Design a protein around this ligand. Structure first.
Ligand SMILES: CN(CC(=O)N1CCCc2ccccc21)Cc1nc(=O)c2ccccc2[nH]1
Ligand SMILES: CN(CC(=O)N1CCCc2ccccc21)Cc1nc(=O)c2ccccc2[nH]1
Lengths: 556, 416
């Protein structure tokens, strides 16, 4: 006998105020019972479980399931109730690595830890909660009672305890072999290195030896699998990676189910295939909860789909990460609030790609969206590479300077350079800081009747120019924008506009280049045509002349 | 040496807060820092049976070359019992803000000599993340009073009061205040000798520590007596354009919410007619009187302005351009406890966010001095922009609460 180190036990508790499960055992067929007894008998021999006395009040149901075309049986314990009553654990398994952050390795070995799993003991005081009962043949004897001595499969705490135990075992080995890397995923260990295959196989053997001190077994005869690896929806090769193949179906009709597999496939593929667009396909889910419904496909989405398949025409691969080289990120504007990006080290070799979509809102502009996309990419890059990439952005340095100096909000983007690939992000208009000498002055106002929705908008000017227009189906806010629209419509290239509308000014000070409001969009189109616009605000009903006059004119 | 029993407020569990992504260098620094702390017994590795988590990051203090570990205890602090046991509280010293000079010391390392309650330690759990989740996060909890925890100064207060005890006796005129890991020392003394006195204080902590703190020698020099506030001021012009007058009337209308007797009529009456914005309007004698009366009014303080310790302090900040920022502190709208302005952000220019972050730190510092607590900020920045960058510029051991302003305020002009 070679003495083996015990694995340190994790203390486990039930949730506060909760007791263990008591759940009726389902009646089983005679053939099933025989199977479970056989299984539990060997499991008992192996030390995995133990028979218990009558005093344990707790019970969890056990099932036996039939693997198809066949005579052989598998044991299944339903832990759903015990899990509800089990305390929360730290789940280390939250984030998976992204291939783009992984490194090239000359050699990679995969070890199977399945047998090592059951050498992980369960907390002594918690075992009583795992009690389960094998029904007797014809219910003529007391059923056989077992409890678990080890982490049961399907229990809430098994994965976190298992991985944390394995990690603690691996720590000294990894620390004293910095020239190799080890990652644990489910039942597997991935051990890579840059050592030549001879020295590598040695270190693996040393690793097998190390796990043996806790009595742990890794399979000798090599698993028959070789690169590519299929892992978490990816394809992994020694020098490159990509997503598992994406095939976009041909269909005469598309339902909400059809498109959701499609958005998933597309979103998933978007991390590698450059220039994927989901907006229009996503657009068909707006406020619609019926799952079986077949929605007619707009032509605008057809073009989008056809654009996708053309991008999907052939396989595309990402490379792995080289720490010695810089990280670059480049962004392109696709239109309709869509943004796409590539992250790379060397030209025409991407680590990964992705897209960004405009947040929902009444008004927006390209500079804000570009800024948002940069923050997102910044965060994603910290996660994956632990650093911020240098940015290549389709916006002129002067544009950015003009934007952030005059913008009311604090804003920032990290180190970046201009790349000239149209379309370029630009400022469409900028308002004047001071009133304009020689420009005509337009005092505008609008008003509406809350009951009749009848209203008026117009202006009076210093040159005696005047207009008032009657409106139907409108509001105070709408009339206030229309007034401003009219003044823009009727003035020269340079104009001073006076309004009492806090609503309008709030919109314009946000500098939207595009809006959900048709009226705001028309105002923007007018602003763009102007050489100079100065917009002044005054408080209403203060007897401000020409504001007072036009207020009276529009309130009649 | 014997722990003081600590519990959470009723009906609420410990913090579970996602660790945000960290740069490689901050990760390495934390690994290095936590490794030593572990050898000092200050922290211990924890298992999966601890669900709780609090975010951690690393910063560099003012004028320092070495990383410091900062934990964000904001969630834990909300959930920890108010420690009212021995004292309801210190009445906040009012004399601290009236001092010519106040110096801020990091005493926080003193906390590490006092063990933390065994039952409470699990709640201090924090995670050092790995790049790309390639290795499991390194999980620790605190064995001793952590820096940034609201229970640390409260517990250690006993020890602290005895340490300073010999000091207040020979210097009864010195106001000393403690907030979190910081010690605030005021005096009316001249600077040069005041500075040396500060040096004296450091020696007290050394001798008791060995019976060496990484941050203790530093100090932050303040002059609250010299802090400037912002009364409402109106232009004095020989020539008033229509535009000038519109802005004035606009400014007076806004002030009228704050000040009762403000009149715009005789000024508003000048606006009679439809006129070019740049046209010069002569002031009528009625208007000049009204403008002059409004000045007198604006010279007096706001009426019915008081601080209520039962309510939150709210701080608003406006970006005025050219590195200038304005801020107001109030519990109640139009009643301002403090207003101020900052042009000086140091080597911060090309970065608005860095300027804002420094602004937030100064405003909180002033708020700690005046009321003994932190204001809730309303920040003129998009959430995703702030949340991305603020940890990069953050130099303080505490952190305040903040919310975001998405709609540009009209009033920015009035504080201009
Ligand atoms: C080509 N590449 C990846 C690879 O072959 N596998 C193999 C199996 C799937 C997988 C999952 C996560 C991480 C790596 C891998 C090599 C590699 N690169 C790494 O950076 C790495 C780090 C820790 C452990 C194994 C590793 N292996
Ligand atoms: C329009 N506004 C400032 C502003 O929003 N600007 C003016 C400065 C640059 C700019 C660029 C893009 C969009 C807007 C802007 C000018 C203004 N001018 C005023 O005289 C005024 C008087 C009372 C109240 C508000 C006022 N506002």
């Amino acid at each position: 006998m070679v003495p083996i180190s015990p694995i340190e036990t994790v203390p486990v508790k039930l949730k506060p105020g909760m007791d263990g499960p008591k759940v009726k055992q389902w009646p089983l067929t005679e053939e099933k019972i025989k199977a479970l007894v056989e299984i539990c008998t060997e499991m008992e021999k192996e030390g995995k479980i133990s028979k218990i006395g009558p005093e344990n009040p707790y019970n969890t149901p056990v099932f036996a399931i039939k693997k198809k075309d066949s005579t052989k049986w598998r044991k299944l314990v339903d832990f759903r109730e015990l899990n509800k009553r089990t305390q929360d654990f730290w789940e280390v398994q939250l984030g998976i690595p992204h291939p783009a952050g992984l490194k090239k390795k000359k050699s990679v070995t995969v070890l199977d830890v399945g047998d090592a799993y059951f050498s992980v003991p369960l907390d002594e005081d918690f075992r009583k909660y795992t009690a389960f009962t094998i029904p007797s043949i014809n219910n003529e004897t007391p059923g056989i009672r077992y409890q678990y001595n080890v982490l049961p499969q399907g229990w809430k705490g098994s994965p976190a305890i298992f991985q944390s135990s394995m990690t603690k075992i691996l720590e000294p080995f990894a620390a004293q072999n910095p020239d190799i890397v080890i990652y644990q995923y489910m039942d597997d260990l991935y051990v890579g290195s840059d050592l030549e295959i001879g020295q590598h196989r040695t270190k693996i053997e040393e690793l097998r030896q190390h796990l043996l001190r806790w009595g742990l077994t890794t399979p000798d005869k090599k698993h028959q699998k070789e690169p590519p690896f299929l892992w978490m929806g990816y394809e992994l090769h020694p020098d490159k990676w990509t997503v598992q193949p994406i095939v976009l179906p041909e269909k005469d009709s598309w339902t909400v189910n059809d498109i959701q597999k499609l958005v998933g496939k597309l979103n998933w593929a978007s991390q590698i295939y450059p220039g994927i667009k989901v907006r229009q396909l996503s657009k068909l889910l707006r406020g619609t909860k019926a799952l079986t419904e077949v929605i007619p496909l707009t032509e605008e989405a057809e073009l989008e789909l056809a654009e996708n398949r053309e991008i999907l025409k052939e396989p595309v691969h990402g490379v792995y990460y080289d720490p010695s080289k810089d990280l670059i990120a480049e962004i392109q504007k696709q239109g309709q609030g869509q943004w796409t990006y590539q992250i790379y080290q060397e030209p025409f070799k991407n680590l990964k790609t992705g897209k960004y979509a405009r947040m929902r809102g009444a008004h927006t502009n390209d500079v804000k969206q570009l800024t948002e996309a940069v923050q997102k990419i910044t965060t994603e890059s910290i996660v994956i590479w632990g650093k911020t990439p240098k940015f290549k952005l389709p916006i002129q340095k002067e544009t950015w300077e003009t934007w952030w100096t005059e913008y009311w909000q604090a804003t920032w983007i990290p180190e970046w350079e201009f790349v000239n690939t149209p379309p370029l992000v630009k400022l469409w208009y900028q308002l004047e800081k001071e009133p304009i000498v020689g420009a005509e002055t337009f005092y505008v106002d609008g008003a509406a009747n809350r009951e009749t929705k009848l209203g008026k908008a117009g202006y009076v000017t210093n040159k005696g120019r005047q207009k008032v227009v009657p409106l139907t189906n409108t509001t105070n806010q709408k009339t206030e924008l229309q007034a401003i629209y009219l003044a823009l419509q009727d003035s020269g290239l340079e104009v001073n506009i006076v309004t009492d509308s806090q609503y309008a000014l709030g919109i314009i000070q946000a500098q939207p280049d595009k809006s959900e409001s048709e009226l705001v969009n028309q105002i923007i189109e007018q602003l763009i045509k102007k050489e100079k616009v100065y917009l002044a605000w005054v408080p209403a009903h203060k007897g401000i002349g020409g504001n007072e006059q036009v207020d009276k004119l529009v309130s009649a | 040496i014997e722990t003081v029993p600590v519990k959470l407020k009723p009906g609420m569990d410990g913090p579970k807060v996602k660790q945000w992504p960290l740069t490689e260098e901050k990760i390495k620094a934390l690994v290095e820092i936590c490794t030593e702390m572990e050898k000092e017994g200050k922290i211990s590795k924890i298992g999966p049976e601890n669900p709780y988590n609090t975010p951690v990051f690393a910063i560099k203090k003012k004028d320092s070359t070495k990383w410091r570990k900062l934990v964000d205890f904001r969630e834990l602090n909300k959930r920890t019992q108010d420690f009212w046991e021995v004292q309801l509280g210190i009445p906040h010293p009012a004399g601290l803000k009236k001092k010519k000079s106040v110096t801020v010391l990091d005493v926080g390392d003193a906390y590490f000599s006092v063990p933390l309650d065994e039952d409470f330690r699990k709640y201090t759990a924090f995670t050092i993340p790995s790049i790309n989740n390639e290795t499991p996060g390194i999980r620790y909890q605190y064995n001793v009073l952590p820096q940034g925890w609201k229970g640390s100064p409260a517990i250690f207060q006993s020890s602290m009061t005895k340490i300073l005890e010999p000091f207040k006796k020979q210097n009864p005129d010195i106001v000393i205040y403690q907030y979190m890991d910081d010690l605030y020392v005021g005096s009316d003394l001249e600077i040069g000798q005041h500075r040396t006195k500060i040096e004296e204080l450091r020696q007290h902590l050394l001798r008791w520590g060995l019976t060496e703190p990484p941050f203790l020698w530093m100090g932050y020099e303040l002059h609250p007596d010299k802090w400037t506030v912002q009364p409402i001021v109106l232009p004095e012009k020989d020539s008033w354009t229509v535009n000038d007058i519109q802005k004035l009337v606009g400014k007076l209308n806004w002030a009228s919410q704050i000040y009762p007797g403000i009149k715009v009529r005789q000024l508003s009456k000048l606006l009679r007619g439809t006129k070019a914005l740049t046209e010069v309007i002569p002031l009528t004698e009625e208007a000049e009187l009204e403008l002059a009366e409004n000045r007198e009014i604006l010279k007096e303080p706001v009426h019915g302005v008081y601080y209520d310790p039962s309510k939150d302090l709210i701080a608003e900040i406006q970006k005025q351009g050219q590195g200038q920022w304005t801020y107001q502190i109030y519990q109640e709208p139009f009643k301002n406890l403090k207003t101020g302005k900052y042009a000086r952000m140091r080597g911060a220019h090309t970065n608005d966010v860095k300027q804002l972050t420094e602004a937030v730190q100064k405003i909180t510092t002033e708020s700690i001095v005046i009321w003994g607590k932190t204001p809730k900020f309303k920040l003129p920045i998009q959430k995703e922009t702030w949340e991305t960058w603020w940890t990069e510029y953050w130099q303080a051991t505490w952190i305040p609460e903040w919310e975001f302003v998405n709609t540009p305020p009209l009033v920015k002009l009035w504080y201009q």
